[PDB]
């Protein structure tokens, strides 16, 4: 692995795959296998009617070209696509377990007061055999502490033994939320007031719940899910997030849907309860809107941002890789970057300038002992009004050659 | 490759993956890629209405287990599955092209008087209009023949010229046959004219069937054309589902034995225009049959009956070939993978239990990591259930004749 800053486009991404939009996408990659999901909506990606959800699993293989390829092996379609939301998948023992939420009022985040917190599970098999292939589970027993209702809320989690750990969130009513507004860091911020951080824990300032991210534990040995909650350090609103394991040490990514826009990732120290030692990263941020744009550090009352995760290639030098959007206040300019917290080593755009691309999921691995990365980017066609997930594969160079 | 007869099951097959039946299956395998097709019928496989027809291509790959696997990459469903019939596929330059017949009166073979000849082509890209192109073929040159049609699972390429297995429907009023050539030398009960009446479906069928090729040339890309090629008189047998394929750089032909000549019909093609095959005088491998033409029959009788059970030439110098055959004189059952010679079965392995019923078998072989592997589509039945499902067995051909 190259560890040297250069402006050379040594990276070469290779794309590897009527009136509708393909949205709410999922990507997990583990030990040769992968899981993906999306929602086919007819019309507006934010408000369109649902056409069909799919969840699939498959294998990650190379051909003679020693380039990874997606090969779907197992696919499930729910008989109603209007009801499945916020799927998260973790891989254990030749099976991929996709934990979804069920709703009759739409997205549990936006009509959150009204949602009876129904969960479920879909286990699909990475290699099908002619219920091994496909099992559904209506989860009924959930342990969530003070939280009024919990929910998975991220693309992928991890296994530890027979215990899965999905990225999840808890909706704690803000009457019971414990926060000293003295801790809200407005020391250098002329504009910031004290209570923003607390009002920044929900969708509205007058949202009824706050959101706190964490994990959902599922111990296969024993079936019951246990909500775990994220540590106070660097506390921001419950957001789509992802736990994954690199080099045998687990790492957490939280998307930055509120004022703290610099990227939130770092090694998890403990998993019960969830403590992450966040990186002091000063180069990778997120595109916001008018109120909380890229690189903002001052506590304001906003909910806005896009999930653009990254993945840790080298621990000792902490080199990491992800697709980020190089736009302040807009979803334009997708870019694949390999970076260090105070420095960006090298990059390559993945589109043209006005290209709009809202979300990016990124998992990396060894293909024949070469470090490759698969990135899902929610790119739009130039005419637009359609979001189509596009999968780029990118080899991480070992030399810093020409 | 082993070349020593043994009763040892050194062969080890590995299966490699609402109210319906999966019938009329297709398999082609070429240079790492594969084509498959089937018809999903609701109910009786013979008389059932059809739900879906899938024409797919994909890649044949191994994982860490060094075993081949199917990986679908491109799939097409026609908007009406009641109208598509007898597809055959050939692979050229990153495109797999499948040639189908179109009918509004059902299977052209069984209602040939009422069938207008309509032909269509589907090209699928094996690594995705590049992905999927349809063509309604309008220009066909068929010589004396009243109507032609593809009739087999796969054919071969030569340059930009594809060669699909096909059949021609020549009305028997224009068929020229000296019944003196009908070989009844040793055959007590066998009359002279059977061979002639044996060239159709009925004795009183209005057409006969003659197998051959359809030639499509890419080089002359303008417009659409298709030229029927008939087959050499030697070992003439009714036009039947057949397959041309290339092994070791020489093309080989397999014709199914749907009439009295029940011993297997295969061998190297000498020429391609017009179609001459030097058939093997093969004495160990025959085809299950109904009462009139039981397996191992060699006497000319008036029958039309048999199952397509092809073989593949693993080794030309010793003519070692591999195929699945049905071990049943008068029933379709007892599917058994065999590797065999002209006058000797070398070694075998059953692929199911004794009553297991398996109507059809397609067999293509290749090198996976420089080892001789074979894929066999076997159209088997799920135990008690009537419905048929195609099952794909992968079988490694041993080089040593070990334990
Ligand atoms: C397929 O079509 C081409 C037509 O271009 C045939 O070969 C060419 O024929 C044209 C004249 O029709 C010549 O200009 C070229 O020199 C020919 N190229 C050759 C012979 O290589 C081609 O032979 C046809 N294939 C078959 C099997 O008939
Ligand atoms: C899962 O349950 C078994 C059953 O007693 C237990 O031994 C194991 O520790 C559990 N896994 C955990 C708690 O992570
Ligand atoms: C985005 O915001 C930061 C901080 O306010 C600023 O440095 C940067 O220049 C802004 N974007 C552009 C395009 O100038
Ligand atoms: C043959 O075609 C005729 C006339 O179109 C039709 O009535 C009959 O059902 C067909 N026979 C079949 C499909 O066996
Ligand atoms: C099938 O027929 C041949 C010769 O007509 C005979 O040798 C063979 O034994 C028959 N099969 C059975 C099961 O008897």
Residue numbers in the entry:
A (entry chain A): 188 to 204, 213 to 325, 329 to 420, 424 to 603
B (entry chain B): 188 to 204, 213 to 323, 329 to 603
Extract from the study:
Leveraging structure-guided design, we introduced a single amino acid substitution (S586N) in HeV-G to reconstruct this NiV-specific epitope on HeV-G, which generated the HeV-GS586N mutant. Utilizing X-ray crystallography techniques, we successfully generated high-quality protein crystals and determined the crystal structure of the HeV-GS586N. At position 586 of blade6, the nonconserved amino acid S586N was the closest to the 14F8 interacting surface. Compared with wild-type HeV-G, the single amino acid substitution caused the top of blade6 to shift toward the center of the receptor-binding surface by a maximum distance of 9 Å. The substitution modified the local molecular framework to elicit relative shifts in the adjacent amino acids Asp585, Thr583, and Gly584 and changes in the solvent-accessible surface area. Therefore, even though only a single amino acid substitution was introduced, the protein conformation was significantly altered, which can explain the strikingly different antigenicity of the wild-type and mutant proteins. Although Asn586 was not directly involved in the interaction with the 14F8 antibody, shaping the molecular framework contributed to the formation of an immunodominant neutralizing epitope. SDS‒PAGE and SEC demonstrated the homogeneity and purity of HeV-GS586N, HeV-GS586N existed predominantly as a tetramer with a minor dimer population, whereas wild-type HeV-G comprised a mixture of tetramer, dimer, and monomer states. Functional assays and immunogenicity studies in mice and non-human primates demonstrated that HeV-GS586N elicited broad neutralizing responses against both HeV and NiV.
